Design a protein around this nucleic acid. Sequence first.
RNA 1: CACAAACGCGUCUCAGAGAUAAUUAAUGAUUUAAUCUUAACCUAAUUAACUCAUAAUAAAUCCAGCCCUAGAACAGGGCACA
RNA 2: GAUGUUGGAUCAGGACACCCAAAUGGUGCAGCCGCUAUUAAAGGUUCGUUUGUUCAACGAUUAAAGUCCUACGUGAUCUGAG
Lengths: 153, 110, 307, 115, 59
Amino acid sequence: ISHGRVFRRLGLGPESRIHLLQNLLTGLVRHERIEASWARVDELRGYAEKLIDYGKLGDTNERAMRMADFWLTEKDLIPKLFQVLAPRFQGQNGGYTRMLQIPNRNEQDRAKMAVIEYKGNCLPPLPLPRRDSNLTLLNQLLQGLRQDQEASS
Amino acid sequence: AAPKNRRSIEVNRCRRRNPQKLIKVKNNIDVCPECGHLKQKHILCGYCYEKVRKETAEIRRQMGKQEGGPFRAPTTETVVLYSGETPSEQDQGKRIIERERKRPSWFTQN
Amino acid sequence: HGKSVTWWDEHLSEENVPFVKQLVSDENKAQLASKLCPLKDEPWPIHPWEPGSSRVGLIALKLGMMPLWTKDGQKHVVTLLQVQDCHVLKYTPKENHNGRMAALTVGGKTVSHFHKSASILEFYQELGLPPKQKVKIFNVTENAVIKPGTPLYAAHFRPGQYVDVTAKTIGKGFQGVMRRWGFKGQPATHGQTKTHRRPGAISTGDVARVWPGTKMPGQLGNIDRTAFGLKVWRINTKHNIIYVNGSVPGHKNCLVKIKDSKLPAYKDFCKNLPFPTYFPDGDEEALPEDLYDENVCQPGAPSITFT
Amino acid sequence: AIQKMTRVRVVDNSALGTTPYHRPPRCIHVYNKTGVGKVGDRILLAIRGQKKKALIVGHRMPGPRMTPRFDSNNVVLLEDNGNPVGTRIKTPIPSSLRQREGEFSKVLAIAQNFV
Amino acid sequence: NTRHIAFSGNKWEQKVYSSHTGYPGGFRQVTAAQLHQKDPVAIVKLAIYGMLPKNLHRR
RNA sequence: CACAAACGCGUCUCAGAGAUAAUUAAUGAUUUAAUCUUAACCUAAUUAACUCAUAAUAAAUCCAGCCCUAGAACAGGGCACA
RNA sequence: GAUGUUGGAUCAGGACACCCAAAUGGUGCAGCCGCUAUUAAAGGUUCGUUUGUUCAACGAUUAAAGUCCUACGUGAUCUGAG
Ligand SMILES: [Mg+2]
Ligand SMILES: [Mg+2]
Ligand SMILES: [Mg+2]
Ligand SMILES: [Mg+2]
Ligand SMILES: [Mg+2]
Ligand SMILES: [Mg+2]
Ligand SMILES: [Mg+2]
Ligand SMILES: [Mg+2]
Ligand SMILES: [Mg+2]
Ligand SMILES: [Mg+2]
Ligand SMILES: [Mg+2]
Ligand SMILES: [Mg+2]
Ligand SMILES: [Mg+2]
Ligand SMILES: [Mg+2]
Ligand SMILES: [Mg+2]
Ligand SMILES: [Mg+2]
Ligand SMILES: [Mg+2]
Ligand SMILES: [Mg+2]
Ligand SMILES: [Mg+2]
Ligand SMILES: [Zn+2]
């Protein structure tokens, strides 16, 4: 039984799985946003997060360097990881990746797809879900409650 | 095992018209405030994501032209420009992509 | 009218999202601490202890398991049950339930208002508690009755006693015959073809049907079970934690139902326990932070020497 | 866990123990209703083409924590009277065996080193 | 007043009501005395039930 | 045991009352002694089943999404803190 | 114009003409074993060496290692040594 397992089985086995994630991660560090299958984007999420946590460990750390070697296939990307992508995340602890669901693919396959993106990339802003504004009848109705809780205190 | 008797059309109507084999009516459909097309509540708008996607493709082409070869990729942050725009000091020292289209309303200046 | 689906958080803005939460939690702590004093509120008549009596139970949280040593040198393994939020909810008179014993409905751990039903939130608004996750019905004699909306702490079972536990066992899904039942397999190597698991003959040639009881592959493990005759070893007062003996059916962190033992050996054991239930206000004393059975080696001690 | 057909090594000093044979001594039968023997259990050994009774001293299968676990499976040769046919037992014996005095009294009496 | 039924002759002792649960070894046989002890309504109810015609309207 | 789990070779937990079969006995008529009686009245003693006390389950309708020790699909439990 | 046939494997449903466990009568029953008879089918009824073998012999034990029927149960579950 499946109880308490944090990994999907994707591709031809465990190795194939690691290499699928390798490709995706290279794609993500290169193009800064990619659109892939929802299972696989959601899988990539964790690794994309922690790869940036090695970037913060400094260029000089060896354990981070041989890690960046395995996980970034295109070699140009490695200086991009350390000098570009790591420094623009400093204050923010975990806030790196936006993952959102796209309409299902248009091919006869019809998979379930997601786009995954690093915060602060220079690309057109993704059409994020908007929150209802505060002039809304219900939200406007809550403001009264708030001001009354302020008036009672 | 081979079926012992042809089934009647009655039995078949029972089986394959079951309320379970019928397609359920999706109740989460809404309209997108911009283009007014249909979208599901938890998913991005298709039509919006399209114009976003096209523009991303074109900006990636022009930044493919600004790069000489397959393995050569910039160490600076990139900032994309549109007709009539000049770089701020915050954004200078960075790679710059220049584009003909005047900056699209949904893409902000920041 | 094609009406849309709505969840609670759909229309709220950035500003109002934290406000709602802070407000609901505030009213929750308020409503909890308000019910913290049962004895001085409007207490129901307390009755003496008769010999045919049956006590109220408790709803707990299974923490995990831990080793524990007796003074005798034997090693037992015990299960930690914690009482998070426990209150009696409603009350059913004798005639209105079994015709024999009165039903006392007890609530479990606190959940969020936002995901429950209209009817249920109504039930808790006429009570004044937050909604409880798991709600179980205890059978109880007329002298053991309490008043609805009363807190129940974990000192309710004094150390050394026997309790019973009911819970949903760990769900293993759709399991083959060798698991569900434990039929031997077929031998692996001697030229058997595609048989290494299957049940084998399921009936007799004359009967020509298979019998209504016959063991076959299927659902295994998500069902209610009960463990009897467990001994209670030690009690923690501050964190409300019972240490019961051996194992309790369920996954760890699951919600679990505790009662006194209904086993025929223990029938009258309830004469020494705080009976309506335990009342921290009434005695006006501080119980020692741990109540140990006389057998247990305490977490500090001489370090046993035989002679 | 010592069961039917396990090769055992005879630790006490006896005629039958030390003298060589083309067959290693094999356990035929364990006297627990379970087919598995433990320390302080009783065996029927086939040694040099005849049947003798034995007492399991130590074995290579793990047991309750703080029990000694031995490198080899060790038995002491024994007759029906419960009298050890050996003079003495060198290689160490579980101190747990002293629990039952009644049956193993003499066996314990000829035992050298305990662990 | 069903509980006060009389049975002619020795029938209380030798009339048996049989039932089967369908499970292997689920076959029960109860003496009229015992059945009447457990369920005061049972005897007259099974009496009547067996005297109606066998169609659906019986139910 | 290279998964956070599964698992045994490991650990825990296991029951009251009522009935009767064959057979032993007490009062005791037909037949005023006797006699357990296919005679009363109460009776007594005693297997297995088999019943049942007791235990499980037992709050009608929000359910888009997203998590899960819950799951083949549909179902089920979470998503206020923190 | 086919009801595929021995023995095993797996899973067993039933009978009682009880092999064990449970109450008892009789003895050529002092007790320990026994030998017979009555009542009782919820539960049990082993592992090996040789044979394709059920049977049988033989080793070692167990409270016992029952007698049977179910297409000599069970091949759209398995095995073919015969
Ligand atoms: Mg999982
Ligand atoms: Mg695949
Ligand atoms: Mg996930
Ligand atoms: Mg499960
Ligand atoms: Mg096997
Ligand atoms: Mg195979
Ligand atoms: Mg084949
Ligand atoms: Mg020889
Ligand atoms: Mg007389
Ligand atoms: Mg007399
Ligand atoms: Mg019942
Ligand atoms: Mg739910
Ligand atoms: Mg034909
Ligand atoms: Mg059977
Ligand atoms: Mg008989
Ligand atoms: Mg039988
Ligand atoms: Mg046959
Ligand atoms: Mg055959
Ligand atoms: Mg067949
Ligand atoms: Zn749109």
